[model samples]
Target: AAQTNAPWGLARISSTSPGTSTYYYDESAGQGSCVYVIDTGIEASHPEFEGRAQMVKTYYYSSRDGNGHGTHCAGTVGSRTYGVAKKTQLFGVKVLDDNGSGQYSTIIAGMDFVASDKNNRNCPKGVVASLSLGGGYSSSVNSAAARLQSSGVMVAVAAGNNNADARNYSPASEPSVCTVGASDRYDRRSSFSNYGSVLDIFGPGTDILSTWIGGSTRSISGTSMATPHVAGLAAYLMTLGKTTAASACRYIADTANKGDLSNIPFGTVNLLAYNNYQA
Candidate 1:
């Protein structure tokens, strides 16, 4: 695998060399892919967005991010500076409130909006969603995730930070959704990351550096940070012609760096997200 300077999270996804200082990815840069961040909201004017990000919907206070979590995850997904898919079109769906608290009902509405949004048709593997939930689950939320799959949108959701079985969560537990858990610089599952059969892969989430609100950048941690990295990988795979959710997930599994995660819990898949792995 090749290497170049980037955040630990970005570099980890592109190469199987474990922790490195470089990010290796295809040059298409997810040009035609689209990703929706279901969180507080995104700061569209952030330099990292470069006008490519927009606040498309709001189920909370405003179209803008009063809380910085949404922008941070958006940057992890596709910011010009610190993104997994550098050129992917980014949209923010404000399902959670400024405090990151949300009802499953509102979160379901956000997923439905992304599923039926007129904007998901830009490219062959275009529509993808990166969601980091607050907590709790419902049958309706699971069904909404299913609807996204039926509608052709690939979703990568956080496995939660409770350090428990992800199988108990809503969208993460939903078979149709791709659940992501957090790993650290050492390629070990984070102590706080959720585990179990529901998790599809692990991504770098320990103190990840990404864009923040107010034209600044920050470092944060959580499975919340892990989800968007997989979202970025989904877009990268789409650019490589993995046009559907099944194909995208299959590619991720087939190409992932396995046998490296030492602390992966029982029922958790021992694979790390890899975007540009070569045999």
Candidate 2:
């Protein structure tokens, strides 16, 4: 089923945006990959999920998507209609509360759970943790991320929406993970996005429409919205046999469309671009 008016973020990665007619070879569809979303919980019952999303509570708070942020990001990661990798196995690891708040220790524990998830049952080719939340820099959290990376789990974090240097944020500043920044539909750097040498890549984050709480859809903006696009794309890459974090990140950086963002102090970084995988 071809998506009509697909989410701009998905379109951008698929190379199907307006005025582009690039033919791609593989969809990947995340058929063999598992993406763990560590955020404010997910609405697994959402129709868009097709009853495929797995939920696990890593915090004391309820593991329901009462705030909609987690649901939205999950949809972008692997929903039927709004996803980048439609068939990916999505796992929800609730760390943030309904008020979009969570402590560092709580988040670290969630990552530990994700890294140690049983394989051959839940994830056969390791897992990719899609983190769309962050706070000020933390050493312990960075250590957790590094541990996950060493365990063959790919980590993707948001380059905080603070509009300041991303190097000041925790997971985003963490060098071992893929840090995503936001770009607009016009292929411009989002005015509110944080940038610097630390940002690994850019994805569509402005006015993005995706699944929301109560089984609805809404348009939202922030670097948080952009992180999932990269996560979804990374999931697809994993299905294509790019399992290791280093190789997956290299594939993303090497194959991305050049100069997709403008007016950034760190010069032009690669923008997320989906295409046929060359052997």
Candidate 3:
């Protein structure tokens, strides 16, 4: 396997190799793929993006990223220094408001926009929507995610950070997405991460540093942080011709680092997103 120069998340997913023949960090490092950060919006002018991040649409917020959460997640998805697919097209779908709060209905609307966009017809691998938001279980939210998946868009969602059963959450417990839990720098589950069979995989989230609003960088921890790691890796996998949500999920689970988690029930195995292996 090839090595990458990207930060922990990308390296954790084996996506940052810098050579032309490498699986990532080469020409296919998101050239024709897309990852939509459906959250508080993005700092579209962030220098780390080199002018690549797009604010395709905003549902509730007007100005894009008043809170720094979206930009941080976006950075982990595709920023040159901190991302997994460094060249993938990054879009911000601002569902959360400046205060990082939004209704489930608003979030559904954002997902609807992404799934129905015809402009992506030319994209080789289509889009993967990265949602780092979650609330109580709502049938409406679950339905929206299912509809988006049926429409051929991959969704990666955050298992809530409350350290409770992820089954209690809406999109995390939902069946359409790859629900992610947070892991620390040591690849151990973070103390604040929600778990259970609902979680599809674990990614580095604790003390994670990435791009922030106003062209700065900051550190935050949550399943919110773990989500974009899976999202970015999904986009990278799409570039390799793993087009559908199910295929991406299978590849991740099959190639993931197994038996690396703690506090799991019998027969309930967990997978850590381990890079540095053959794709």
Candidate 4:
């Protein structure tokens, strides 16, 4: 079962233009890799997961989603239809609560859990984490991201929505993780996306349609919406063999389409995420 028209975000990255309304990617490449969604809880029962998504940990009451942000981000990473890594395993690590907000402490706790997970230990192949939220500069969160990378997990993070230089944030500014900014269908920077030196790449973000809680779907925007796309891309790339977090980011940084977009920031290159489709 397949749809004829691809999501604009998926189609945009697979070719030089978003004109085709098609997405080209290999289903087998999505296997073997796994992504840790570190945000709000995911509704694992959603039909889109196909039993591939699990609520492994929760900082709040239960693993069920109180807010819809995590579910959407998870969908972008590995939902059966709207996902980037269609067959990749997804593990939910709930840090935020129902209101779509949480403290740095709780977030770090989730990071610590990922760092220690048997599946993530030693940076096993295809171990990816996506963080779609950010707080202003925090030495703790920054060091935590670094440690997570050292522990062998490739992480992708949002550059925030403040429309300011991303350097003022924690994990986004941290070099170890891949920092992602937002772009639109026209290949232009999103007006509200954080930019500058921290960004590793861009992903289509405006009005992105993805799986939601209660087995529904919704379209939303944010660098938060952009982060998982890169995480899924990383997952797809890691399928070949073992890779370090550093090398994982390096592959994405080099393989991206460069200078094809408009209004990129001063300190960052205009690298955008690609699935390496044969367009």
Off by over 4 Å in 4: 1-3, 120-124, 242-244
Candidate 3: give the clashing pairs.
4-16, 12-275, 14-275
Candidate 2 lDDT score at position 115 = 75
> How many clashes in candidate 2?
0
Write model 2 residue lDDT over 116-205, tens digit each, in one string.
Answer: 773544565547889999999998988898888778888888998888898888888888788898988777788889887888888888
After superposition, the stretches of candidate 1 with alpha carbons farther than 4 Å from their true spots are 1-3, 119-121, 277-279
Candidate 4 clashing pairs? 123-152
lDDT of each: 0.84, 0.80, 0.79, 0.85
Q: Estimate each model's TM-score.
A: 0.95, 0.92, 0.90, 0.95
Score candidate 4 by TM-score against the native: 0.95
Q: Per-residue CA lDDT of candidate 3, range 1-279, in tens?
A: 243344555555553221122233444776788888899999989999988788988886285799999999999988978887777888888999999999988999998998987355456776888899999989899889878877888888998988788888989988657888887756567888888877788887888889999889988999899898888888887787754556686678777878766655443447887544444
Best by lDDT: 4
- The C-alpha RMSD in Å for every predicted model, in order, reads 1.9, 2.5, 3.7, 2.1
Model 2 C-alpha RMSD vs. true structure (Å) is 2.5
lDDT of 4 at 27: 55
What is the overall TM-score of model 2 with all chains considered together? 0.92
Indicate the residue-level lDDT of 174 in model 1.
Answer: 84
